[model samples]
Target chain A: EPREEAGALGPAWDESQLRSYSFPTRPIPRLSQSDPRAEELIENEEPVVLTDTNLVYPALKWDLEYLQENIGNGDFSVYSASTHKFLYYDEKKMANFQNFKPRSNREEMKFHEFVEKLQDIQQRGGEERLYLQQTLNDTVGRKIVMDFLGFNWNWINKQQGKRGWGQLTSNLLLIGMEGNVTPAHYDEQQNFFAQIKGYKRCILFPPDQFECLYPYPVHHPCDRQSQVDFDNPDYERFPNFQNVVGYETVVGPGDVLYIPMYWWHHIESLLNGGITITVNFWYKGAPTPEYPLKAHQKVAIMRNIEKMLGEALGNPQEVGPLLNTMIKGRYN
Target chain B: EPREEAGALGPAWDESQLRSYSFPTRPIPRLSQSDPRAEELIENEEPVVLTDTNLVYPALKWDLEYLQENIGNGDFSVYSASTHKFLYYDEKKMANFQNFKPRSNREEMKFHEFVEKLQDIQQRGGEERLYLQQTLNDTVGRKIVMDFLGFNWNWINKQQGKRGWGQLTSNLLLIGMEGNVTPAHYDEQQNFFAQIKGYKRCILFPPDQFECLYPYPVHHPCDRQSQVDFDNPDYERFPNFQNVVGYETVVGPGDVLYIPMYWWHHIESLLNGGITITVNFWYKGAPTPEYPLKAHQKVAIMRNIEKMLGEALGNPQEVGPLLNTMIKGRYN
Candidate 1:
């Protein structure tokens, strides 16, 4: 009883398919920069797509069958949800979400078992969804690790050194079932998001949309993640959403996307698609004490000022009246 | 009678001397690039006191006597006010002030007459004030223009070109009488205010202080000027005044102050100080489109959205209630 916008049923997963509701997004162009332009781009924190670099194609050989045969005696964790969203949380707790209930369940199992579960969910259309967001360590066999290490590390390291950012922090190996969504969020560090197996649709917003996104309380466990549910955005609830402007991109294997620091992004596996594999390289960006930071600083300042005034006056409700009295006619 | 805070002074005007209500600002250390800290300072758009660079000294040598002697028969206009503040006008009309009895009178007189009037005001200790805000054009003299042209133009031109800012807008030759105030306001261009003759106290606030400063209606002729009176603030009216944080400086001869674009400044000759002169170089800075521009952009967005919503829904005041309903329990 499914709609026939996409043709024929033999395909395991359709490439450009839509499942549940989501924001309307389009593809952004990928580009490479010359030496001077690279410097200019970096100075402005503008993102550019990297194409011709090194031998990352060797790692593209990492398929489910290859992973199942090579990675022995390995225990990994996967997440499952009734919905398309899977928010990753540590076994340990984070502030404010200490007693928070997760929207998905984290299950510890073998990589092969997770792969089988993913296949079952894909074949039989059900409410259940599986996503394997595991860290790839040496447990994946010496050959796989050696192949992974053969990436264009030299060029990456040189760029890292040139920018004088901190060392490579972590490389996350994310495996997503079709239609899996990460929800809109931002990373504190600079990222090199490389796609391997399938396609990913990325929606990006500049840091200036901080208000519209309504990030969780600063001390909340989901601090960097935006609270707005893009799939079913409550426009009446998040009025600022009326102002968000985003750039979109649909990137597949052999595409490397540079996500600049403090940029907000939402990535989804294309609807009815096969497994999507991605590894992101995180780097500590340089110290920024002024200019572009002013907007964020102002937000932080107002929050603190609000809290301080609330405390001084006994209740927060009185703050509004006081402000109204101060600025109503005199300032205007 | 004046307060005893300044101690006994035989004369009201003190030339090149720190006087009443002046902020204690010092020379910030200047360092060259080969250092790690050089990048740090350049990243922030803080007011850096420029000390080094030459050929600027020749123009600094052009005092009132030399200028009057060289620039023959040049009729210059000067403003005569009964108060320290002088908000310039085009001798036409504006909202609520047509055929208006001005706070100050605009007069066109020779430099000799203007100078004599200034001397009379200084001697009488009356409320009357005079200011010569003119341009150092070629109409002065070949020798005067030639001497005036001997500033550090090459270095400034290079910096301007490197930053890719727009062409030279205008250079204002400003000579202020004792206690002359320009009020709190911001210009749309970047300014290199080179101090030539006497000391002037400058108070600056970041653009983020939009709420506290309470600028006038957007379409008003005095649009960029803040409505807040710093000398007699009337905090009950501009209560947000309680939140303003400003950086202050009293700059004297041979110093060039870099005023970043869109920063609000209230500049005045130190109370009872002699002819304070300055020539400011203006350049159009680049538009920073993303990141920390959130707060500033948010203001405009709200105005635009409000207008749009009002047109569709048939009322503008409904914007606040709608926003409140949307985020009161949801976002915070």
Candidate 2:
């Protein structure tokens, strides 16, 4: 009874309390590609949501107490937000400004302190939001590394390596408070996102949605991150955002979602749900014979053309208006 | 008998006469994808070779007479070579000159005139070389336009369109003399090189061999071409060139080779062979969900970074040396 209570510790998520959001729908469903379907979907360059069951990762039992015991009192980077919901990579003072010390809405706290503060925030029902996002290293002590190595890497390697994807580069261990949200962003690596604790919802847009999701300039810190805020999208600014068709899914503990490389995604810890823990494996994806798609090549070309034109023109700011001038009517 | 002779008009390739080349064996074989195998290879994003039979192109009857009667009267731009061996985009005077006139070893001659001069050179065994390479446009002629429109668009568009690759952008009609060679280069679109008359060899390297290829600087006229000469490769100058493993194949009349997008290829009309006639279809490829191998993205990144660094550092030459200083040993 005690163990069962611990397992079902938090109250179930309340959908009404969450800020209502909408995703444009298509007739096609984002396949939950697994096993036989995975081979086909993988070859087709389609997104597939999978659960890590090949080797039961010991890290799957990632309860707060287990992580605390394994991780100990070591220092960990935690981003504390005064706002209840986190806005990922909020640029309080963008590099767009002349004088910049590279600041963000983030802070560092010890692992023990973070755990204590997160529990405190939950108990006090405070507005302060704390997310523990720390990179695991062999340096994080033998005990921490012990749990870290407990992952099913052999299984992951077999899945991706068989398909000719490259080596694992890095992993991010994220522990988010209930209702914590990460704004839409795209990563340049194939991601195997494994949820370990609580429930989290992911909203994904294919790379084709580039127009709908305006990306920041290449030099910007927020590069590859969409400028649109899904909950209250600025339609005038990102008019195409309203037309964006997204693939959505919810993942629970022991589930792994295959987030295709360059797919824009927004992640949220379900409202009223308890603290959520997840770890993502980033692997360099395989190269295809074709130019992938011309659109992606266009994306690459646009990036360089902007940099080249921006330098040629006087400022990066001038690139937008100059492009507008060139493509207005005749070019269009 | 007449049709067979017309088809086999060119001298058959002599294995002893061809230069010996080497390609290290990989466990993976580049698929000879066609028809039944195509569906699998298409999904896998692997290269394939196919010939269109659904609508046999009238271009197959591309003897001097057929071409001249149709496209012969047009003043096609022919690249004249003083040497016996043809060079791809040879610039007797490169764009480096200050006149601001874009120039190459190019001359405007009637297609009939081009055919005569080429035949004259072949008969006299002279050093002069002529290659008729002109873009297909109605300006070329009404007959040329008719024949161009007769190409199997229904076939190519069906194949490429079924896969959702973008529209067919352009086509090239090439008539090359014996020993004609195009230096190693990569194009940004999927190429369908269909041989109509003589055999031609294509030596290919995946984009992964970027470092070995030694592509010219972006500002250079030969930006996408490799500086390494396969005939007399200067290993001392390009040491990595020795390590490259190329994929080589020769396509004959009625055979189509699917030259994958961005694959560096060195094409040669076999020595002692007759004037070769060929046409190519450039299809915009579809996008995929991968990092496209670290190498391609590296190439893309390198291009942008070069432009950015060049603008910041005041010159293109500075970027290489600066990068060396930053990465010579420490970064590596």
Candidate 3:
């Protein structure tokens, strides 16, 4: 029997559930949906946890059993990794480099098959980790589509319109095994990630920490992904990573986290918690640029400069030399 | 005669009173001293105009004649420029270079002498522009010291203490001729610039626009100053300057503007609005560094990196080459 007291409830998750890292981090603020400060944070493109929004109320029951029964037999993209990290990479960009080998393997699996693999892995201790990341489209079953339709579109649509955000992109349905991790990376589109089941820890860094994160070259397959290994950082090579400041939070069921565009985020399922299910609404960012460009806007500009230099120099290797030549005696 | 109606009164100064520059600019916000938003902006280290704070009420009578009579016979540091712009430089840094000539000339002048020179320039229409920038010290007359003591130190000291700012370094008393301009530069201290007489136009750029501004090398005499000529920009060399966004405002008597540390500012007395006088309270910024470092903090970090690279390379010119070598094939 549990005691009924305000202080007795305890925290939803403990420190043991989180994966330890070397850098310092502050807690991300959790605010009610009606809080004006939440809207202000969204307007400034800062991360915020919005509670009690009922954003994916219909998808709250999207456990393994429900997903196996409702999710269609269509081939879903599932990534397998020997380690816990399922690092995402661009398959097309890999072709540009001859010696590159992807860290994770991507495979297509049916809904039931993916569920069976997870159950097998759970029953017997294994080194392999699986994460199913599939876009919710016509491939999904009718019942799952009905639940998708039952989401809080009115509220989210109003937010998109009010903030001048561009058109809605695809909605990704993510299912990750316990302890599975997605390494730090940033996307160009805005994200409103809704947690359907279990607890997932999120670590986010602002776009201004570009120097700290040290992203890969645009021509590389792991572009937009950080080069520093969080678990075992090479301090000599990436010394700035030691000073990186991250904002962290653990989201449970019925929580929606607004991840601003161009922010670096590392996500992982809780160690002891069961499988995690997450549905994310991705939208194109606002097009028009305003005075005093935001941090994320400047990041986009930096990316463009890299791409332009690569194109103009004919080879990516020459870009750095040209930049050094131009700024060596002058700017330095 | 002044008109009675608001529409007929017209503006305090016309557009022709401003020297034109080709760049996009938005107005800096002006708020009442009692406005809560004003404090919020100050906390965030953003520029804002604070009105009716009575910060320097006693200094409001500091016209040329009044200053000449009460400022004592002590020699003041005055800068004279061939053109309208008086660009500041580091005299000590100039010694390091084998061949470096400063554009502006520094002269020691008595209060009456500076006043006479200004009158001669105005009457004869000379090309030389003079700006008197002297610190308020013990050398000033007793009446001037009394006025300085009568200033709203209670309000300003409270601001410094509450904001965790360091000691009050010095208060600069600036006297400028009509159309005299201080080209864009950033300072390491927080400034509370109080307008005492006439009108002055101020244009500010946030610290994140480092790429657009193209600041001189750290070891250079003109360090912290932008290389671009605002009046006639060379787009071929400084293409990014065209896309720069500046925040602008004109401050009159009784208006005090807070200039955040490391923020670039270009200031000028109104074109035909006669002489202007301003007293600025400059204080060292807060010592503690917080998580998610501010834009100014990042700029400070960049400066340190440049200085470190120069030291490690033994030659400042070689610093850029080493950076290019490290980031060449690896990062870009």
Which structure is stronger by TM-score: 1 or 3? 3
Off by over 4 Å in 2: A1-14, A25-34, A52-56, A88-96, A99-104, A291-294, A311-315, B1-332
Task: List clashing residue pairs in candidate 1.
Answer: A326-B239
lDDT of 1 at A86: 71
| The best candidate in terms of DockQ | 3
Kindly report the TM-score of the first chain in candidate 2: 0.84
Deviation in angstroms for A172 in model 2? 1.0
Worst 10 residues of 2 chain B by lDDT: B323-332
- Residues B20-104, model 3: lDDT tens digits: 8898889888899889999999999999999789998998877877778888888998889988988788888875565777789
For model 1, what is the alpha-carbon lDDT of residue A242?
65
Error of 3 at A131 (Å): 0.6
How many clashes show up per model?
A: 1, 4, 0
Clashing pairs in 3: none
- Considering only N, C-alpha and C atoms within 3 Å, which residue pairs clash in candidate 2? A292-B286, A292-B287, A293-B286, A293-B287
Better DockQ candidate (1, 3):
3
* Best candidate according to TM-score: 3
- Cα error, candidate 3, residue A4 (Å): 11
Per-residue alpha-carbon lDDT of candidate 1 for residues B210-328, written as tens digits (9 for 90 to 100): 67787654323465677877667767867777778777666667767777776778888876556888888888776554333334333444344334434433433343443332233
DockQ of each: 0.03, 0.01, 0.06
Let me know the DockQ for model 3.
0.06
